[PDB]
Amino acid sequence: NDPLLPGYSFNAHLVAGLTPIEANGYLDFFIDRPLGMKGYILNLTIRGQGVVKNQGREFVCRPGDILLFPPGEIHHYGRHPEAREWYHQWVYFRPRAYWHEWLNWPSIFANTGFFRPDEAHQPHFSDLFGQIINAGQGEGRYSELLAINLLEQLLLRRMEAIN
Stretch of residues binding a second copy (CB under 8 A), selected from 12-20, 24-32, 113-121, 139-147: 139-147
Q: Is 157 in the site for a second copy (CB under 8 A)?
A: yes
Task: Report how far residue 4's alpha carbon sits from residue 118's, in angstroms, rounded to the nearest whole number.
Answer: 29
Backbone angles phi, psi at 27, to 5 degrees: -115, 10
Q: Which residues contact 38 (CB under 8 A, 6 or more apart)?
A: 10, 11, 12, 71, 94
Helix (H, G, I), strand (E, B) or coil at 160: helix
Kindly identify the residues of this chain, within the stretch 20-49, that bind ligand FCB according to CB under 6 A: 31, 41, 43
Contact 159, 102 (CB under 8 A): yes
160 binding partner (options ligand FCB, a second copy, none; Cβ < 5 to 8 Å by kind):
a second copy
Residue 38 neighbours by CB distance under 10 Å: 12
Whether residue 88 is annotated as binding a ligand: the answer is yes
Q: How open is the CA angle 162-87-79, to the nearest 5 degrees? A: 100
Q: Is 127 in the site for a second copy (CB under 8 A)?
A: no
163 binding partner (options a second copy, ligand FCB, none; Cβ < 5 to 8 Å by kind):
a second copy
Residue 112 or 131 having the CB closest to a second copy: 131
Whether residue 141 is annotated as binding a ligand: the answer is no
Q: Is 86 in the site for ligand FCB (CB under 6 A)?
A: no
The nearest distance, CB 77 to a second copy, in angstroms, is 29
Q: Is 153 in the site for a second copy (CB under 8 A)?
A: yes
Residue nearest to ligand FCB (CB): 19
Give the DSSP per-residue string, 28-89: -S-EEETT--SSEEEEEEEEE-EEEEETTEEEEE-TT-EEEE-TTS-EEEEE-TTSSEEEEE
The annotated binding site for alpha-L-arabinopyanose is made up of 3, 19, 33, 77, 88
Residue numbers at the binding site for ligand FCB (CB under 6 A)? 3-4, 10, 19, 31, 41, 43, 75, 88, 90, 92
